[PDB]
PDB file of C-alpha atoms in Angstrom:
ATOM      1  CA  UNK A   1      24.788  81.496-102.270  1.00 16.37           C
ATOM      2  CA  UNK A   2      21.738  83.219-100.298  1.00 17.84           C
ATOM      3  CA  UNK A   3      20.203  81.750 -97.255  1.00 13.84           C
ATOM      4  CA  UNK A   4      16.819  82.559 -95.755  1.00 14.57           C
ATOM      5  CA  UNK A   5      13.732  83.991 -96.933  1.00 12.25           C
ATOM      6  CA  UNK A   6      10.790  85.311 -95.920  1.00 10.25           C
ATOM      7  CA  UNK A   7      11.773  84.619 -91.951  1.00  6.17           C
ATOM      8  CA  UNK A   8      13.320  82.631 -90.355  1.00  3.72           C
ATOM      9  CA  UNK A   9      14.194  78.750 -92.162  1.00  2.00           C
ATOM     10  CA  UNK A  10      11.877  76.627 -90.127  1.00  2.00           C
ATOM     11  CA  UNK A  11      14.168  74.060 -89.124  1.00  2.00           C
ATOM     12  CA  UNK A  12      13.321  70.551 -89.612  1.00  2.00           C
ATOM     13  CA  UNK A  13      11.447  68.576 -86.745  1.00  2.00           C
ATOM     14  CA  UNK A  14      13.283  65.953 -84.652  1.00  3.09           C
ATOM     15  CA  UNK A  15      11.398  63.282 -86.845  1.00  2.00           C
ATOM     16  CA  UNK A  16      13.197  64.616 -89.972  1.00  2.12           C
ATOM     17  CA  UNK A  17      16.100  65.510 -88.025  1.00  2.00           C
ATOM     18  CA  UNK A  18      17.205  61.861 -88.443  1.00  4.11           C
ATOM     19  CA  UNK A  19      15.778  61.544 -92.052  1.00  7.58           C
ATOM     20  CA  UNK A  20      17.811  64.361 -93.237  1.00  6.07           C
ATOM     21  CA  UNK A  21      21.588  62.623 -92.181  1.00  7.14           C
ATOM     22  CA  UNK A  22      20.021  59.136 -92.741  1.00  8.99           C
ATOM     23  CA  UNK A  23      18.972  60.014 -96.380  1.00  8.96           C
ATOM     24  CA  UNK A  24      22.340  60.357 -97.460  1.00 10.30           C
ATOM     25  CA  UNK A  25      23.480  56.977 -95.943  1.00 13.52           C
ATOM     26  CA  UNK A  26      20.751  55.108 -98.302  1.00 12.51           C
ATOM     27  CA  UNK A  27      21.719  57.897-101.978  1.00 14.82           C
ATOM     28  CA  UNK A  28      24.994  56.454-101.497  1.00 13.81           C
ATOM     29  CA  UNK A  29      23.518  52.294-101.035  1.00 13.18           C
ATOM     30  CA  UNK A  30      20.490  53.250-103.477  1.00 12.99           C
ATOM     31  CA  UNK A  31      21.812  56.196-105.867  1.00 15.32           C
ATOM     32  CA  UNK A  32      19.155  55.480-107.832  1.00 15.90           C
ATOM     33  CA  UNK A  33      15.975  55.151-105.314  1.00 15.17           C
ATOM     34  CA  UNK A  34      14.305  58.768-105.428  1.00 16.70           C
ATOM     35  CA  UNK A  35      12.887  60.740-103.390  1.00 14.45           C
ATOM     36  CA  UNK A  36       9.738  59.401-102.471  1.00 16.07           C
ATOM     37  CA  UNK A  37      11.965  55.673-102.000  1.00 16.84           C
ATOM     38  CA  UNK A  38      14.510  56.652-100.204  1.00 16.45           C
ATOM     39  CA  UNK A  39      12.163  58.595 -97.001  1.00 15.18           C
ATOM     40  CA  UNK A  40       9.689  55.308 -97.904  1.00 14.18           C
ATOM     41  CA  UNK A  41      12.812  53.253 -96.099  1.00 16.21           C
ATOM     42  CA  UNK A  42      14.012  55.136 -93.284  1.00 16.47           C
ATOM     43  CA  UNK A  43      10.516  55.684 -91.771  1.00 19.58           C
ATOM     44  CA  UNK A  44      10.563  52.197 -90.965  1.00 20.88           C
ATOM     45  CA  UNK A  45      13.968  52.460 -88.764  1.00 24.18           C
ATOM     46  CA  UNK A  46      12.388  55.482 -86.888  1.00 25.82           C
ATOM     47  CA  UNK A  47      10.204  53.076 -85.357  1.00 22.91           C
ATOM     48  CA  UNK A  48      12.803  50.552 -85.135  1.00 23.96           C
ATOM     49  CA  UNK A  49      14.946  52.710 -83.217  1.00 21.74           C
ATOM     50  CA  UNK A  50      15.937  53.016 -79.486  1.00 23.74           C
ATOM     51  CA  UNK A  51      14.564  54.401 -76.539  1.00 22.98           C
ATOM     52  CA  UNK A  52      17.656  56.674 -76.427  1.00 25.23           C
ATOM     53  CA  UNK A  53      18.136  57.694 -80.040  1.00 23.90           C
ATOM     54  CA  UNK A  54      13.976  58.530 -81.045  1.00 24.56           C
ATOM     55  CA  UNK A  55      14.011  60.442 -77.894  1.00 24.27           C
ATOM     56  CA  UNK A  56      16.929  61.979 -77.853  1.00 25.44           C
ATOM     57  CA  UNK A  57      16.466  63.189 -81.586  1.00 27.19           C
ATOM     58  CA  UNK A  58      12.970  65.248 -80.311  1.00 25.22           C
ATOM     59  CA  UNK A  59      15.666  66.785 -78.119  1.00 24.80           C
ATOM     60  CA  UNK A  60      17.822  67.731 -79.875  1.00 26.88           C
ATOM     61  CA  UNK A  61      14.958  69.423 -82.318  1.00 26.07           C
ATOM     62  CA  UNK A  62      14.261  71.534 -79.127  1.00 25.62           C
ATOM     63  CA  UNK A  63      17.640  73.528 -78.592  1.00 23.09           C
ATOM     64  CA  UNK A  64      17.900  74.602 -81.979  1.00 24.11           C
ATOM     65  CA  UNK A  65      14.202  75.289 -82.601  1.00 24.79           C
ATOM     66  CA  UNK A  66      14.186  77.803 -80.187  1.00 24.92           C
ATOM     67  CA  UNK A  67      17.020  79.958 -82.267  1.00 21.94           C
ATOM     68  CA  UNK A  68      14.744  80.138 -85.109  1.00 23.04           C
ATOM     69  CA  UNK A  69      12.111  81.044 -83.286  1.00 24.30           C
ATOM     70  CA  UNK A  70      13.645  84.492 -81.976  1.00 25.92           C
ATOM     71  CA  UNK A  71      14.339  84.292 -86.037  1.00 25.83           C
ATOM     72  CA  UNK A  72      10.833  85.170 -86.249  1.00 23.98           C
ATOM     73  CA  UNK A  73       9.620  87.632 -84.023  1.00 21.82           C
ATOM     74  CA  UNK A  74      12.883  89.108 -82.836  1.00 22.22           C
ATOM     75  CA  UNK A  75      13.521  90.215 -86.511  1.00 22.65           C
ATOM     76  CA  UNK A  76       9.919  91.200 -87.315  1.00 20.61           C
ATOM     77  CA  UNK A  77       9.405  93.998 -84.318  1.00 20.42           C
ATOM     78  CA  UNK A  78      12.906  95.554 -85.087  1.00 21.11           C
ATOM     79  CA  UNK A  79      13.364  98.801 -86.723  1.00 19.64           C
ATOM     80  CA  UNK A  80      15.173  97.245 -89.606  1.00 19.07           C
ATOM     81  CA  UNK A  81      12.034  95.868 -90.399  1.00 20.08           C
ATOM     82  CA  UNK A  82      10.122  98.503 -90.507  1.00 21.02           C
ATOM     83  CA  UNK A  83      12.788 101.169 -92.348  1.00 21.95           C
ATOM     84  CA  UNK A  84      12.928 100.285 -96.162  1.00 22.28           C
ATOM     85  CA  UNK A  85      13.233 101.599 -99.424  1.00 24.98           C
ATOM     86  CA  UNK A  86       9.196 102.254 -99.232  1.00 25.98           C
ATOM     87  CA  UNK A  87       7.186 105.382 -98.987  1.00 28.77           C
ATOM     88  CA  UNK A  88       3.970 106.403 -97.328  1.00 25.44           C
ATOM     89  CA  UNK A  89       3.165 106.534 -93.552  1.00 24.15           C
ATOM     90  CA  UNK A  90       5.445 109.443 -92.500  1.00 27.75           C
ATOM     91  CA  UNK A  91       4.978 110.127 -88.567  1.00 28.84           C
ATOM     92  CA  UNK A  92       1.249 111.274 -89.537  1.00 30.44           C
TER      93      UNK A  92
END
């Protein structure tokens, strides 16, 4: 399998952080709910959660982010980026 395109893959925010483990718990209780039923759910518990799981979640969203980021730029000004199989401006 290939991973990654065009950049870095944004990684999900701390909100869907949760919402991507938690929507397995519910396929498994509701393997039939779809897609658009199953994130319907969980939304509720977000706000139903603690003071030290909703915030810690944005947290941990933060780390991580910042590895993509570099993803971004730190890829796009390198010289691999520029050399490729393509023709045209030649030093003038």
């Amino acid at each position: 399998g290939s991973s990654g395109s065009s950049g870095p893959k944004a990684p999900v925010t701390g909100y869907v952080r949760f919402l991507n483990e938690r929507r397995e718990q519910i396929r498994t209780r509701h393997p039939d709910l779809p897609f658009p039923e199953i994130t319907k759910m969980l939304g509720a518990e977000w706000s139903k959660l603690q003071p030290a799981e909703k915030q810690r979640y944005l947290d941990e969203a933060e780390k991580e982010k910042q590895q993509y980021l570099k993803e971004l730029w730190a890829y796009q000004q390198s010289e691999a980026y520029k050399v490729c199989t393509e023709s045209g401006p030649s030093s003038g």
